[PDB]
From a paper:
In the present study, we explore B cell responses during ATB, while focusing on the immune-dominant antigen PstS1. We isolate and analyze a total of 85 monoclonal antibodies (mAbs) from one patient with elevated anti-PstS1 responses and find two antibodies, p4-36 and p4-163, from distinct clones that demonstrate inhibitory activity against both BCG and Mtb. Structural analysis reveals that the two antibodies are directed against two different epitopes on PstS1 and do not compete with one another. In the present study, we characterize two different sites on PstS1 that can be targeted by antibodies capable of inhibiting Mtb growth.
To further understand the mechanism of the protective antibody binding to its target, we produced antigen-binding fragments (Fabs) of p4-163 and p4-36 and prepared Fab–PstS1 complexes for crystallization. We determined the structure of Fab p4-36 in complex with PstS1 at a resolution of 2.1 Å. Two PstS1–Fab p4-36 heterodimers were in the asymmetric unit of the crystal and had only minor differences in the constant domains of the bound Fabs. The contacts between p4-36 and PstS1 are mostly Van der Waals and hydrogen bonds and contributed largely by complementarity-determining region 1 (CDR1) and CDR3 of the light chain (CDRL1 and L3) and CDR3 of the heavy chain (CDRH3). Ten hydrogen bonds are observed at the interface, and one salt bridge is formed between Asp36p4–36 CDRL1 and Lys136PstS1 (D36L[OD1]-K136PstS1[NZ]). The mAb p4-36, a member of a different and smaller B cell clone, binds an alpha-helix structure within residues 136PstS1–145PstS1, with the epitope being 30 Å distant from the epitope bound by p4-170. Amino acid substitutions in the alpha-helix that holds the epitope of p4-36 residues K136EPstS1, D139APstS1, and D140APstS1 reduced p4-36 binding. The binding of Clone 1 mAbs was also reduced, indicating that the alpha-helix bound by p4-36 might be essential for the folding of PstS1. Testing those for binding showed that for p4-36, mutations in the light chain were more significant for binding than those in the heavy chain, as opposed to p4-163 where mutations in the heavy chain were more essential for binding compared to mutations in the light chain. The fact that the germline version of p4-36, p4-36gl, binds recombinant PstS1 suggests that PstS1 could be used as an immunogen in humans to elicit B cell responses and p4-36-like antibodies in naive populations.
Author numbering:
A (entry chain F): 1 to 141, 149 to 228
B (entry chain E): 5 to 216
C (entry chain B): 18 to 351
């Protein structure tokens, strides 16, 4: 009944602000308290804050580590909540999740007892480095391995699909390498039958939203 | 950090493991709102236990929650391969702190078999070369356990300059993946008969070679 | 035909029992004695358990009880009846000095407090009924009565009726109840013991008869608004108690044994009750029977004037129930 999708993540300079949004495509958004939980890369879960339902005053609570800097708002008319983040510090770098509860003790609007529903998360990078879109290069090929090289980008994340997502079987998108220059590089490789190579078009679709880079590259033998 | 869990937990297939979560009368021992989340690598957390001992619909009975005093424990019986994950405890902590989490526990299942890495080495593309750059890409996948050493060769000689290798990361099949990049100028690329990526895993080396 | 005048020869009516009724009975007795100085009336606060027990054994003429007789009581002591004299009520008091609001509570939340699953006063289950109230992190200390008590009966009936699958299954209701041994729970003797025990430790919660509300307020105890079955939260006052009793006015049976706990009136306070005289059919002689008839009949007519009942926050019997009470009084013989 709850389907959450965060947006708005990306690159922000220390000391500046960034607002995230969480939307429910279900019909019960006004019925529960909306929470934010974050997770710095490789680290644990940390509760950020929540905002109560309007039946309980629509009031907010925040972790000590973000109180005074972060504000949560909700707009029930659009089934959306917001996380406003001021005076950001590098230690705020994290994947930010929005979470929702099922009904508990007839009061999930007053306190989100448990986090039944999670968004996919949106990565916020607080850093002074400037954004940089990637170069994308084809990695030309029983089975055959072909791929795409996604070179020299900042910050994370980059998304790669193949054939607008019609090809998922045999896709391996590897974790990025952080090189000494401070730029990331990544490779996505798809395994296909050798028969396919002369009859099937293989295109990789690369998206680096922080720099508005969207690239499609055909990979041929 | 606010609740303390053991950093690491391990058990053999079919056995049990218990993950502890020690708090205080102000959280774990002060209410009955203790929960446990399971997080596989690169996925969102999933609620496994709530109200100290209850399981959401879907969660199997082999996941058991209990509590003694200010310490809650999660118990996982009949361990399977797919139990390998992080586990987080959580609790209400009063009307000032509200929600606290444990630091999280990585579960290892003990019996898994050795798996040699699959290695794939791509040469620089014509398009990168036309851009006056050259990267060799060594992709390493499906090895277990998750530790590999990577050596590059320029013809007969070791290189170790322009090499950048990732940490190993857990794949969805519980094997591990890594990647290594060797960045060269086109002149360097053309000036050697061959380049090799050598992947050493538990004392056994897999090597792939490419030539200009 | 009920006697309205007592005998003129010397007669002693001995009373004991309900501490909820005691402050009112200690006004009735002296007033009736003033009008009929041959009638000696002694009273005592000992709990509805002792009132039933002593009236059944015949050591007193009147046992005072906030609880009607069980079918097990009526099967153990025939002649014994429960005669409604007035309508009382019970509040939930608590010791939270930093809290100025009348906290809203209901039976399910209170059941969880007396069962030990809600242990802290800022538990979301409590805070959710009180949005906009700052609650402390104080440990809940649930107080119960140590003696057989009509107040226990009413409070555990409220828990049983509003939490039938939980408290209603165990430990249920009664003048004595096996209260869960939550860490820190205490037992007290009488409504007076509940007041002073509640006032002694912050975080205490206690069920206390409305004739002790003034004392509880003087000692700084908060007073809860309790939820009824219609979803509304109310303080016990003249109007909320009246509204609760009014629907049960036509349903009160001939023997007057009826629970008015947790009624369906949306403006009804959920913990109200008849104050009962537990008396036997047979007295020792014609003079005692006549005189006991006259006191009881006086108590439900002159003794129900607001000048008496307002002192203890009770409400008068409705006219149809006075008829039922007189019917039982008129059977007292020798």
């Amino acid at each position: 009944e709850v389907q959450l999708v965060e947006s708005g993540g990306g690159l922000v300079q220390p000391g500046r602000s960034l607002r995230l949004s969480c939307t429910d495509s279900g019909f019960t958004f006004s019925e529960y308290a909306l929470s934010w939980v974050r997770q710095a890369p490789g680290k644990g879960l940390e509760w950020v804050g929540f905002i109560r339902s309007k039946a309980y005053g629509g009031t907010t609570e925040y972790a000590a580590s973000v109180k005074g800097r972060f504000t949560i708002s909700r707009d029930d008319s659009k089934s959306v909540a917001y996380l406003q983040m001021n005076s950001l510090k590098t230690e705020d770098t994290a994947v930010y999740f929005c979470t929702g509860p099922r009904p508990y003790y007839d009061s999930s609007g007053y306190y989100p007892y448990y986090f039944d529903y999670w968004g996919q998360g949106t990565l916020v990078t607080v850093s002074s480095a400037s954004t940089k879109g990637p170069s994308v290069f084809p990695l030309a090929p029983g089975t055959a391995a072909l791929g795409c090289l996604v070179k020299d980008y900042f910050p994370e994340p980059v998304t790669v699909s193949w054939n607008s997502g019609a090809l998922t079987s045999g896709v391996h998108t590897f974790p990025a390498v952080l090189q000494s220059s401070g730029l990331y590089s990544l490779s996505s490789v798809v395994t296909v039958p050798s028969s396919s190579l002369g009859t099937q078009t293989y295109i990789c679709n690369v998206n680096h939203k922080p720099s508005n880079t969207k690239v499609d590259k055909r990979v041929e033998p | 950090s606010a609740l303390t869990q053991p950093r690491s937990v391990s058990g053999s297939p079919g056995q049990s493991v218990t993950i502890s979560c020690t708090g205080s009368r102000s959280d774990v021992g002060g209410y009955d709102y203790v929960s446990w989340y399971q997080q596989h690598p690169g996925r969102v957390p999933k609620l496994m236990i709530y109200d100290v001992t209850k399981r959401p619909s879907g969660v199997p009975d082999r996941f058991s929650g209990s509590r003694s005093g200010n310490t809650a424990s999660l118990t996982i019986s009949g361990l399977q391969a797919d139990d390998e994950a992080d586990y987080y405890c959580s609790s209400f902590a009063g009307s000032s702190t509200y929600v606290v989490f444990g630091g999280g526990t990585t579960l290892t299942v003990l019996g898994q078999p050795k798996a040699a890495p699959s290695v794939t080495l791509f040469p620089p593309s014509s398009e990168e070369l036309q851009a006056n750059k050259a990267t060799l890409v060594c992709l390493i996948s499906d090895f277990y356990p998750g530790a590999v050493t990577v050596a590059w060769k320029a013809d007969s000689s070791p290189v170790k300059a322009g090499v950048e290798t990732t940490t190993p990361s857990k794949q969805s099949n519980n094997k591990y993946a890594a990647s290594s990049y060797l960045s060269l100028t086109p002149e360097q690329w053309k000036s050697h008969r061959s380049y090799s990526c050598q992947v050493t895993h538990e004392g056994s080396t897999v090597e792939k070679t490419v030539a200009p | 035909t009920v006697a309205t005048t007592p005998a003129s020869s010397p007669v002693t009516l001995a009373e004991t029992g309900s501490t909820l009724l005691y402050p009112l009975f200690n006004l009735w007795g002296p007033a009736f004695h003033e009008r009929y100085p041959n009638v000696t009336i002694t009273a005592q606060g000992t709990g509805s358990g002792a009132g039933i027990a002593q009236a059944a054994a015949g050591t007193v003429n009147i046992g005072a009880s906030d609880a009607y007789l069980s079918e097990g009581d009526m099967a153990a002591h025939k002649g014994l009846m429960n005669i409604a004299l007035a309508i009382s009520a019970q509040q939930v008091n608590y010791n939270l000095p930093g809290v100025s609001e009348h906290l809203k509570l209901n039976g399910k939340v209170l059941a969880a407090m007396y069962q030990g699953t809600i242990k802290t006063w800022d538990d979301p289950q409590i805070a959710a009924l009180n949005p906009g109230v700052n609650l402390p992190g104080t440990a809940v200390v649930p107080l119960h009565r140590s003696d057989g008590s009509g107040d226990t009966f009413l409070f555990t009936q409220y828990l049983s009726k509003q939490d039938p699958e939980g408290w209603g299954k165990s430990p249920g209701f009664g003048t004595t109840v096996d209260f869960p041994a939550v860490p820190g729970a205490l037992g007290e003797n009488g409504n007076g013991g509940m007041v002073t025990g509640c006032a002694e430790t912050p975080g205490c919660v206690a069920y206390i008869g409305i004739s002790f509300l003034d004392q509880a307020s003087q000692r700084g105890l908060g007073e809860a608004q309790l939820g009824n079955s219609s979803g509304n939260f109310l303080l016990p006052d003249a109007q909320s108690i009246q509204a609760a009793a009014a629907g049960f006015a036509s349903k009160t049976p001939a023997n007057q044994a009826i629970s008015m706990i947790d009624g369906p009136a949306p403006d009804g306070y959920p913990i109200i009750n008849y104050e009962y005289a537990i008396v036997n059919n047979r007295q020792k002689d014609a003079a005692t029977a006549q005189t006991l008839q006259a006191f009881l009949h006086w108590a439900i007519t002159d003794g129900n004037k607001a000048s008496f009942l307002d002192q203890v926050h009770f409400q008068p019997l409705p006219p149809a129930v006075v008829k039922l009470s007189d019917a039982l009084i008129a059977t007292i013989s020798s």
